[PDB]
Each structure stands twice: as C-alpha cells, then as structure tokens.
Amino acid sequence: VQPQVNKEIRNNNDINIDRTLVAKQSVVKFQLKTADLPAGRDETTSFVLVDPLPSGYQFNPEATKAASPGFDVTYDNATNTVTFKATAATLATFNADLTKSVATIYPTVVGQVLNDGATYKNNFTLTVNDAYGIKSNVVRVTTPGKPNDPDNPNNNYIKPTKVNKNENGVVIDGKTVLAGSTNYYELTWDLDQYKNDRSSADTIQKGFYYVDDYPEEALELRQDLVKITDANGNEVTGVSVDNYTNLEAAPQEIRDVLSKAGIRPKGAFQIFRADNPREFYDTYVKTGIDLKIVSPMVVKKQMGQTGGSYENQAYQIDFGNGYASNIVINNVPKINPKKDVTLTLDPADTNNVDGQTIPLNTVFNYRLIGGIIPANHSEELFKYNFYDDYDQTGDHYTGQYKVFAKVDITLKNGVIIKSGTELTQYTTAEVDTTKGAITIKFKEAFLRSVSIDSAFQAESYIQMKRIAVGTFENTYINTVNGVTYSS
Ligand SMILES: OC[C@H]1O[C@H](O)[C@H](O)[C@@H](O)[C@@H]1O
Ligand SMILES: OC[C@H]1O[C@H](O)[C@H](O)[C@@H](O)[C@@H]1O
Ligand SMILES: OC[C@H]1O[C@H](O)[C@H](O)[C@@H](O)[C@@H]1O
Ligand SMILES: OC[C@H]1O[C@H](O)[C@H](O)[C@@H](O)[C@@H]1O
Ligand SMILES: OC[C@H]1O[C@H](O)[C@H](O)[C@@H](O)[C@@H]1O
Ligand SMILES: [Ca+2]
Ligand SMILES: [Ca+2]
Ligand SMILES: [Ca+2]
Ligand SMILES: [Mg+2]
Numbered sequence: 016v017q018p019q020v021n022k023e024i025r026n027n028n029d030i031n032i033d034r035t036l037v038a039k040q041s042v043v044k045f046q047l048k049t050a051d052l053p054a055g056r057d058e059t060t061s062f063v064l065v066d067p068l069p070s071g072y073q074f075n076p077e078a079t080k081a082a083s084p085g086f087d088v089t090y091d092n093a094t095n096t097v098t099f100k101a102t103a104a105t106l107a108t109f110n111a112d113l114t115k116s117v118a119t120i121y122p123t124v125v126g127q128v129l130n131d132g133a134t135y136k137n138n139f140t141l142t143v144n145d146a147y148g149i150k151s152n153v154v155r156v157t158t159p160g161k162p163n164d165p166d167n168p169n170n171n172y173i174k175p176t177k178v179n180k181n182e183n184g185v186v187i188d189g190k191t192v193l194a195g196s197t198n199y200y201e202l203t204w205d206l207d208q209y210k211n212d213r214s215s216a217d218t219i220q221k222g223f224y225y226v227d228d229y230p231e232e233a234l235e236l237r238q239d240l241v242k243i244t245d246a247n248g249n250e251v252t253g254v255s256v257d258n259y260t261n262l263e264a265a266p267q268e269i270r271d272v273l274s275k276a277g278i279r280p281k282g283a284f285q286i287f288r289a290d291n292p293r294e295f296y297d298t299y300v301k302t303g304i305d306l307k308i309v310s311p312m313v314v315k316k317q318m319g320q321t322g323g324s325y326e327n328q329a330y331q332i333d334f335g336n337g338y339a340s341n342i343v344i345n346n347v348p349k350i351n352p353k354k355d356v357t358l359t360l361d362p363a364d365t366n367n368v369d370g371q372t373i374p375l376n377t378v379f380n381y382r383l384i385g386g387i388i389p390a391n392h393s394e395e396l397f398k399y400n401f402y403d404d405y406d407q408t409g410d411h412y413t414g415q416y417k418v419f420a421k422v423d424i425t426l427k428n429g430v431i432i433k434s435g436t437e438l439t440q441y442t443t444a445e446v447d448t449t450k451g452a453i454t455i456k457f458k459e460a461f462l463r464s465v466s467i468d469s470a471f472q473a474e475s476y477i478q479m480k481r482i483a484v485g486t487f488e489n490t491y492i493n494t495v496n497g498v499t500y501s502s
Contacts, residue, residue, distance in 0.1 A: 018119075019050040020141045020151040027215035033154045036167045038214040038334040039131050043072070043156060044082070045124035047099065047139045052109060054116045059109040059143060062101035064122055066139040067094065071130040078125035086122045097124055131173060131336075132160030159208040169210035169303050175225075175331040175340040176203045185467075187393040192345045194319025195497035196394045198234065202227060202308040202329045202340070207246075210303030214334060219296045221335030223289035224272060227310055231260070231283035233318050233325035233347065240311040243287070246304045253295055254306075258285045276337025278330050285310060300333070314347055316498045322349030345393075350386030350500040352493035354403075357382050360476050362419045362435045373481045378413060380476045381405070383455075384421065385493045386500055390470040396462035400454060400494040401475050407451030409487030413478035416455060418442050425469035438473060453477060 026032050027042040047064045068074055080088045085105040089098045099122035109117060128135055136155045142148035157164055164170035178201045179187050204225050243251040259265040260283040289295035329340040357367040357380045373379060383401045418439045424432040441461040446453040455475050465471055493500050
C-alpha cells in the first residue's frame with residue numbers, strides 16, 4: 016500500500032466534473048495522479064499506468080500525448096485501453112535522490128463522450144517495477160438524456176414536443192382545418208435535463224437553436240405573431256428568428272449547424288437562434304427552464320380548393336446536437352359549392368331541370384348548395400354566405416328565398432337539427448337589383464352555436480322569374496369563414 020493513486024475527471028476547462036453532468040460530444044479529461052514516492056524507495060525501474068477507458072469514450076491519441084509530457088503513450092484500440100509508461104528522463108527524476116521522498120508527474124487522457132443519457136465510469140492501474148500495483152478509485156460523469164439519474168435529479172430524456180391548437184387553446188392535432196384558419200403551433204424547447212450542467216466554454220459556444228420544418232406548400236408564416244416565453248411565464252428576449260425557403264438559400268452558418276446536427280429540412284423552415292450563447296446558457300440551459308415558442312401559421316386559401324394533408328415537426332439543437340420532435344398532422348377540407356336549377360322548393364325533391372329550356376314567365380328556383388364543413392373541425396363557424404350574380408337580362412329575382420340544413424347539424428347544447436330542417440330564420444338577405452346580385456348570410460350568432468365537432472352544410476333556394484327566352488348563366492360563390500369558394 017505504497018504510493019496511493021487518485022483519478023480525477025475534469026471538463027475541457029479543468030473543472031472537476033465527477034458525479035455531475037456534461038453535454039454529449041463534450042471533451043472529458045482523465046488525470047491519473049499518484050502520491051509522492053516515499054524515502055527508502057528502490058530505484059524505480061518501471062512506472063506504468065493502465066487505463067481501461069469506458070464504453071462510448073472516444074480516445075484522442077494526439078491530445079493526450081501532448082497533455083502527457085514525460086510519458087510514452089501506447090493504445091490498444093481493440094480493448095479501448097490506454098497505457099502510459101514513464102520515460103527514461105522521467106524515471107531519473109524519481110531516482111535523483113532515494114533518501115528523500117519525491118513528488119510525481121501524471122498523465123492525462125483526452126477524449127470525448129459520444130452518447131446521450133450514458134454514465135462513464137473510470138479507474139486506472141499503477142504498476143511499479145512489475146512487482147506491485149494499485150487499482151485506483153473510480154470516478155464518473157453522466158450526459159443528459161437519462162431519467163432516474165441519482166447524480167442529476169433533474170435529468171431525463173431530451174425530447175422537444177410540438178402541438179397544434181386553435182385560438183381558444185383547444186388542441187387540434189389530427190383534426191380538419193378550414194382554409195384561411197390559423198394553426199397556433201406550440202413548440203417546446205426541452206431544457207430541463209440540462210440543470211447544473213458543467214460543460215466547457217467551447218461546448219456552450221456551439222450555440223442553441225430551434226428549427227420548425229413547416230409545410231410551406233400549405234401554410235404561410237405569421238412571424239409577427241411569434242411569441243417566446245419560458246417555463247416561468249416571462250418573455251424571452253435573447254432569441255432572434257428567421258426563415259429560409261431551403262437549406263442552400265440559407266446563411267452558410269445555418270447550413271453548418273443543421274449539418275452537424277444531422278437535421279435536413281424538407282424545403283423551407285423557420286429557425287430560432289440564441290443571440291448570446293452564454294447568456295442563454297446561464298439563463299435557461301443550466302437552470303433547466305423550458306422555453307415555449309408559439310408560431311402561428313395560416314392555411315393558404317388554395318388549400319380549400321384542393322384539400323389535402325400537411326404535417327409539422329420541430330427540432331432543437333443544443334451544444335451542437337440535434338433532436339427531433341413528434342410530427343403533427345392536419346388536413347384541409349375541399350369546400351365544393353354546387354348549383355342546380357329546380358321547379359320545386361322542397362329539399363326532398365331531387366328532380367331538377369338542369370340544362371332544360373325554361374318557358375317565359377316560369378317561376379323557378381336556383382338551388383344553391385353550400386360547401387360541406389366536415390365533422391371534427393378546428394375553429395368555429397363565423398361566416399357562411401351564398402352569393403349569386405344572376406344575369407338580369409334573363410332572370411328577375413322574385414324576392415323570396417328559403418334555406419335548409421343539408422346534413423344533421425349539432426349545437427353546443429346537444430340539440431341535433433335534423434337534416435332538411437328549414438333554417439331561413441337564422442339568415443338575412445341583401446339584394447342589389449341594379450347589378451343583378453343577391454347575398455344570403457347566416458347570423459354569426461347561430462353559426463358560433465354549432466359545435467366544432469359537428470358537420471355543417473346548408474343550401475338555399477332563391478325564386479326567380481324567367482323574363483326572356485334564352486340560355487343564361489350565373490355565378491354562385493359560397494363563403495366559409497375567411498375564404499370564398501366558387502362554382
Ligand atoms: O466503447 C468503446 C468505443 O466507444 C466509442 O464507440 C468509440 O467510437 C470507439 O473508438 C471505442 O472503441
Ligand atoms: O477501485 C479500487 C479501490 O480504489 C479505492 O481504494 C476505493 O476507495 C476502493 O473502494 C476501491 O476498491
Ligand atoms: O452524489 C450524490 C449521491 O448521494 C448518495 O451518496 C447516494 O448514495 C448516491 O447514489 C448519489 O449519487
Ligand atoms: O456527430 C456526433 C453527433 O453530433 C450531433 O449530436 C448530431 O445531432 C448527431 O446526429 C451526431 O451523431
Ligand atoms: O440523436 C437525435 C435523437 O436523440 C434522442 O433520441 C431524441 O429523443 C430524439 O428526438 C433525437 O432525434
Ligand atoms: Ca427533458
Ligand atoms: Ca418545410
Ligand atoms: Ca347580374
Ligand atoms: Mg451531481
């Protein structure tokens with residue numbers, strides 16, 4: 016039990032990190048120190064230290080040789096073990112005077128920790144004059160991403176999350192979203208597992224970013240509504256945000272970050288940047304305070320013509336490492352208005368006279384079927400109008416009209432308006448005799464009483480009198496919330 020040995024583990028700035036936390040890809044150093052050799056010691060013929068480096072610890076031959084003057088460094092890549100042998104020069108010093116005790120020099124293993132949520136344990140062995148050895152104490156350090164970490168109570172999985180909500184805070188993931196509506200996306204910068212992190216300066220300078228890969232074909236950003244707040248409800252000011260249509264069209268700096276994180280957007284994307292890496296680090300990262308980003312995005316009007324699916328996903332890049340969030344999907348309903356020409360004013364009757372020549376002075380009806388708003392939608396109905404621009408040369412608006420439910424409508428109070436029910440009393444009409452047009456509008460009140468889980472569809476009949484012999488056409492435009500749909 017002669018020279019006691021002692022291993023120490025420090026980060027790239029020499030801070031003792033034993034039993035603490037450090038970022039993935041962080042440089043971790045091993046100091047294999049030994050106590051001063053006593054007086055009466057035999058000449059030291061051999062001084063060997065053997066370190067079986069831990070799993071997932073990448074050895075850096077170059078740096079350790081540089082950081083281990085006085086020792087010949089050898090490495091067994093096969094067993095990931097490194098060996099240090101005191102040079103001839105170094106030994107002479109251990110023998111300069113045996114009658115006295117002499118302090119020693121120590122080797123330093125330099126390398127990086129490569130895995131998330133892993134524990135890296137370490138000890139080394141000292142053998143002197145191939146006669147006796149001492150196994151050293153074990154030291155350790157963990158990386159973020161490991162729940163139930165007895166050393167870092169706040170540690171857990173690194174996982175950003177994304178969620179879609181409507182204006183009233185209701186979660187609308189997977190639901191149908193009317194064209195023109197807004198997606199109030201809530202992104203979470205998952206920072207809690209970083210609490211009490213002891214990473215070095217180089218590591219903290221690899222920056223902090225948050226990316227949102229948004230469907231640029233279906234949505235357009237409303238970056239003016241972007242809002243960033245932390246877990247404590249306070250506004251965040253150190254984060255700037257920008258967007259690019261595609262990697263190539265982005266600042267070389269951004270391409271490099273996204274590249275080293277293994278993140279490759281599908282086209283255009285929104286990226287958030289921490290302006291002062293250090294300030295951000297001391298304020299939110301090592302304090303474990305999660306950030307909340309709200310990035311509203313509106314569904315382009317053309318989506319309502321074609322219909323279709325659009326999905327959203329985010330990423331967060333901490334200390335240069337990237338992590339992806341869950342994917343949120345929504346689909347847009349294809350609002351398809353239709354008009355028919357009928358002699359009856361009964362929702363029941365399916366007979367029409369489409370394409371049939373109508374006799375002079377015939378009182379008929381234009382059946383204006385509104386677009387269908389599918390069940391399980393995301394926002395309330397605030398506008399549902401039928402607009403008809405008839406040809407005054409051929410048709411004279413009679414002055415009468417009726418409106419009917421085309422599907423079973425459900426109210427927020429549970430009442431089910433059975434399909435085919437007259438609903439005229441919830442509408443109003445403003446006619447422009449001059450130009451030859453008419454507009455039937457539902458009362459906003461009534462529309463907002465319909466449950467958002469309910470399907471909705473109406474149709475109206477506008478009585479017309481044929482004042483001239485001939486074939487005339489008409490434009491019927493159905494308006495649903497903030498978008499108009501023709502035909
Ligand atoms: O676990 C041991 C291994 O850890 C890492 O995977 C390193 O890439 C490799 O060099 C080393 O041998
Ligand atoms: O790792 C070898 C030995 O190193 C130190 O002496 C520790 O105190 C002891 O508990 C351990 O068995
Ligand atoms: O360093 C904190 C440590 O406190 C106690 O010693 C626990 O036994 C150990 O599991 C924990 O990691
Ligand atoms: O290159 C090492 C690691 O760096 C970052 O963590 C990247 O996000 C990851 O994909 C990569 O494996
Ligand atoms: O290395 C990248 C990955 O690391 C972790 O598994 C994260 O939970 C995951 O979201 C991320 O994509
Ligand atoms: Ca976490
Ligand atoms: Ca995109
Ligand atoms: Ca007209
Ligand atoms: Mg600790």
